[PDB]
Design a protein around this ligand. Sequence first.
Ligand SMILES: N[C@@H](CCC(=O)N[C@@H](CS)C(=O)NCC(=O)O)C(=O)O
Ligand SMILES: N[C@@H](CCC(=O)N[C@@H](CS)C(=O)NCC(=O)O)C(=O)O
Lengths: 254, 254
Amino acid sequence: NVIQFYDIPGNATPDKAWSPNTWKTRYTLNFKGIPYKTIWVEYPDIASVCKEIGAEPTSIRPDGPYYTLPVIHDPSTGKTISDSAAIARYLDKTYPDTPVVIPPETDALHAAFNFAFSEAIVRALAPIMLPATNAQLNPRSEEFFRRTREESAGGVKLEDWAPPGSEKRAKAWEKIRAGFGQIAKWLSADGNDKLLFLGDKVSYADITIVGWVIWVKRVLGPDSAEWKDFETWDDGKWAKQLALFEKYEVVPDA
Amino acid sequence: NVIQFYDIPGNATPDKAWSPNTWKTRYTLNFKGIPYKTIWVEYPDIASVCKEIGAEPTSIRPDGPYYTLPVIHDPSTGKTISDSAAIARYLDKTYPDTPVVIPPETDALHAAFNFAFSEAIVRALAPIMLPATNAQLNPRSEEFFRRTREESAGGVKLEDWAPPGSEKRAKAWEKIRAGFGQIAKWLSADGNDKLLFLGDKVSYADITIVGWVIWVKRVLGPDSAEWKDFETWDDGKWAKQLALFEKYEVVPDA
Ligand SMILES: N[C@@H](CCC(=O)N[C@@H](CS)C(=O)NCC(=O)O)C(=O)O
Ligand SMILES: N[C@@H](CCC(=O)N[C@@H](CS)C(=O)NCC(=O)O)C(=O)O
């Protein structure tokens, strides 16, 4: 009767957890110390599971509703909640004696932050990270993932997005680096070079960063040349942020 | 012996104030209740005056330092501050007995909000708003403005950017409208539909919106069809935000 947490398995790590969006929620559940069970769902099975547990789609597009993980279902409440930001607000509200991740006065600014973060980071990560995460998916997720991502890119095959050693890949990295350079400026805009957005207390905004960053580390690989370069950017700010949350970087087989 | 506030004069209103970026600081000074004296600078003189008074350039691109208004000089302290967000931070620390606009635990989220806002609003406004502000600049500024902006747009004359009745202008408006829709989403992301980002207290994020919005109202004109349509967007949230700040929508006679 614990909270049920829906995740997509991958082969990047033995514990199977790789997704940037589900890591945001997994970090959230771990940081709040709330117990949960993990339910593993292949990409093509996501919509039929959501329909079957009553999860709202996270956006409605031309061709219909679009279902994503993370989803949690809270049996203590009956509620099914989809989207990591919505899950964070739900957990803040339903388990108020856990550490708050979105203090109410910062709620709107957190929603502004998620947009600024998508533009500066998610869009730049894609040409390198999506072909990489595709290469570690189970066969039925690869079929679905390749087909849909290649289609959303106009038909450009993943292998052509940014081949190793190419200049496409090299300029993808430069825009990635610039993106994280912007987050570095936000975190030091008043002269005080912070690791956390609020200063001393963890916020969902920090959980957002480490969620996307642990995705890079785990899929590119901790010993990959590109990841070890990444650890040195902005005097290792991003490596350091990961370290702070390492106690919460946990996939309980239990 | 008062703070000197450097602004760009225009003809859209009697009081000569039109700039989106200087209104952010003009709202900021008025809301904080700090006395100051405006001194008007035409565009082609901005770089020359900044050098004269020791103002930092607000950004540095390969082709040189880039000097912008607003700027303030504080004879009380001897300091010259450029960039509206830097001015607000400077005024917060330097006059602590005035109402704070950037609470320190929200400082970094304010800097992400500035990026989120630029991306969502500023670029969308440009095809419609840069030509309209050109038409109300004094001739020394019009020469400089039309030249630099037409050049920055590949040679397209301002009158062709989004002319009235065109489909270019219709699609520019839908992009602007959707941009303000995301701010509406951020202000109500927790289901509490706010007018102010912090909830009940004014913050520089709120000041950022009205400085850009009052630029649209003054330069398109309060009676223009386009502005009166703008007042109806999002059940009047942006009109209502202007109303909240009408007290401080003042160019003091001084
Ligand atoms: N805004 C959502 C994004 C969720 C999302 O994109 N999830 C991906 C996994 S990383 C997914 O389930 N993909 C659905 C699909 O592509 O079919 C959140 O933050 O939860
Ligand atoms: N980031 C700056 C932007 C200021 C800015 O771009 N100001 C314009 C007036 S709206 C300017 O002075 N431009 C000078 C030019 O185009 O030469 C701020 O927020 O203060």
